[PDB]
Design a protein around this ligand. Structure first.
Ligand code: FE
Ligand code: FE
Lengths: 174, 174, 174, 174, 174, 174
């Protein structure tokens, strides 16, 4: 008994969207963990905390958009446990940005695998949806984090103690 | 003697666009028939009539956009008879929404076949055009009609006489 | 079992309105064909295309108003195939205007026959409706097209190559 | 080595806040599941979906405020897996509201246990924080859901098919 | 040692972008040459000069966007000599428009080859980027130039001495 | 057969303007190369990239003004290959500013040679044109770059890793 709206939507695509939803929610939770770390008294980097909180909310919005897609196409959302982040302590501004870069590239890889699946199942609506709302956004986010990692490294973070402070004010404070 | 503008535009694609134009015009005419039915004195559901008239005008706009595409790419528009709708009497609000759902899925299937052809002929401009302006719009329309059918069925239409009346006011009147 | 609203509405009038609806929809489709022709790359007369697209939408509005009339008076709308226009290629600006003039006079003749029928069946509401919304509009459209044909002919269209270009800009561009 | 800011903040309170954070995030995820269910084509109750999405975002805000508290008082946030909701299918508007009521009372009970702990450890700042931002908000939410359950039951939900439809429009649409 | 941001970006794609950059810069330089020609005292067609100067600046913007893409994806921009246009004297308004049409179709062909390469290397971000910002823009530009060539030819350019003058004022002056 | 407008315009001056046009276009291309380098992920200095992109567009404007001059005076523009910049990698903020300083002084020297030629051929309009729009602009640009080089050197660039970062924000970000 398929959904009345369902058309040219393979079960593999439905399953892969459900996995992507979980990954985006996981990414949101990792960013929330990072945001919390920079709000600690012994870290105290507000704009780092604000940056990662913004990323957290963006990743949640990405998850909710996939949920909308799933229902649009007549698929059924099956939620799974959102696993806790790998770390509680993210060590430094630089380390968190490096971990964020690793995370975004892992999310991007999953989306490329999802696109590949959509192309293989001749699902052009899903292909377009991924292209329009996800792939371009990932490339921009990966580039931005790459830029942030570069600058922090050059400034001498984390050993140079004014590096992450001034980066917080100049880059992330504007 | 090809058009001066023509480039990477297969004759099969040109022919398939001409068929799509006819189908969109047909869809416009079906919706106009529905709109007329709900303006009858013995049916008298104004917001149903307004809904389907809006759909009629949207389907015409879709046809005219395909005509623009055809001329853009150097193809030549060949018009065919717009066949009369299958029915004059659409029975009920629910039945019309169900018939509209069937129609939109038939239009969507044709667009997916058109996309498939464009992919096979390595015509990425045409692929993108279909993706951007048609596929996303169909999925939204199919979902919307699916929602409308669900609600009307649940409310008890058409046997429950206040179902289509209140649906006209609450869903289609806002 | 006549409609509850039906009064002094002969079956011949009902049938003749249904024929007029089809003719107005046909006229809309002819004008759309013309509009498409002037959007071709090898014709490229934008204001000609805009003019005939406007006429197309006006003829559709005329058809929808007749549909409203039919339902107002308790008649039942029976739709027929909208036949394809006689031509795909309309040759020139002048030729299209001449064909448009022929079309409008054919539509006007049908309306005069419809009025005659309404007078014969002592249907003054229908008479007035045709007089108010159709006959005056046709006479104006016929005169306008007559004017356009005259000017284009005088300017030397279609052989004089700047005739239709400058007519597009001066008459139809304002 | 306690935090420099830490004062009159027991380790049991720190641990209990971390548990409350997880519960609020869980509650957010349950509400997101509900919101998704009412966006299904075969359920199609938009204002139910909007209601529960709002609740989801509120519960997340509650979690983030506890995280702020934890860092304010010098405690350390330890995140745990956000467990998947008990259900994917929430059956009906009424059932979801009943499940939401059960959830909010479970969250409220945890907060009362958290307050009890704060009182036992003579932590008046934490007591006040829970009183100010949580207890009053829970009582209001529990009352609101109680009201919603009552109305839906009285209207005849879920068997009366117009009950949840009209409740969606009148109560949740305003 | 690949770029930190680089992901699913083939070396062939990187090389092909660098070639496209050069071609867009070349196209900018051809249009600048045309613009200069119509600013000559013995040609003196200001709106032709303004038209081609606008095209020149658009082609430069296209080149700079490809440069942004290259850096976004972690590729490295390698610039080459921007070759001088084939001509200094562009003869006439019509001839320049015909040469512009030839140029745009050559640029479009290169972009289609670039898309083909991106599809072959399963690079959907690059595919989408080309589709979104380039292919649609080329088709529009090719159509526009096709229209301009048609009108000028019909008006009798370049032999009819008022053709290019009036085309400058009516088409390119508005 | 000289141009109808040509008066007191030596062929040597005409030739020297054509060379200056090429040099200004070359300078534009060098600055574009620099701008691209600072948009790299492993360099990531946005205001450096914006600075040099602004310089690129200014040098193009200078070239187009010389083209206008050439046509004003009845000379004929003969375009040559715009040679690729000497480097792809500009190493550092400081190095690029030093290379920019060298470039501007080379452009200025060419303009002084062009002025000398104009004085020798008793061409006061050309002398004034160079004086008004070029010489004053070069001196200002050379001074500005001199200032930038000084500050960066003093701050400890490129070895001091916060030098180019903070210079990007304070000097080039305002
Ligand atoms: Fe009501
Ligand atoms: Fe500073």
């Amino acid at each position: 008994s398929p959904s009345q709206v369902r058309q040219n939507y393979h079960q593999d695509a439905e399953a892969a969207i459900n996995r992507q939803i979980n990954l985006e929610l996981y990414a949101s939770y990792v960013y929330l963990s990072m945001s919390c770390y920079f709000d600690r008294d012994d870290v105290a980097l507000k704009n780092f905390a604000k940056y990662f909180l913004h990323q957290s909310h963006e990743e949640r919005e990405h998850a909710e958009k996939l949920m909308k897609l799933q229902n649009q196409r007549g698929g059924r959302i099956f939620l799974q446990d959102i696993k806790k982040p790998d770390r509680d302590d993210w060590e430094s501004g630089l380390n968190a940005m490096e971990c964020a870069l690793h995370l975004e590239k892992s999310v991007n890889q999953s989306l490329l695998e999802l696109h590949k699946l959509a192309t293989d199942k001749n699902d052009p609506h899903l292909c377009d949806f991924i292209e329009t709302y996800y792939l371009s956004e990932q490339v921009k986010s990966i580039k931005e984090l790459g830029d942030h990692v570069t600058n922090l490294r050059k400034m001498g973070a984390p050993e140079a103690g004014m590096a992450e402070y001034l980066f917080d004010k100049h880059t992330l404070g504007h």
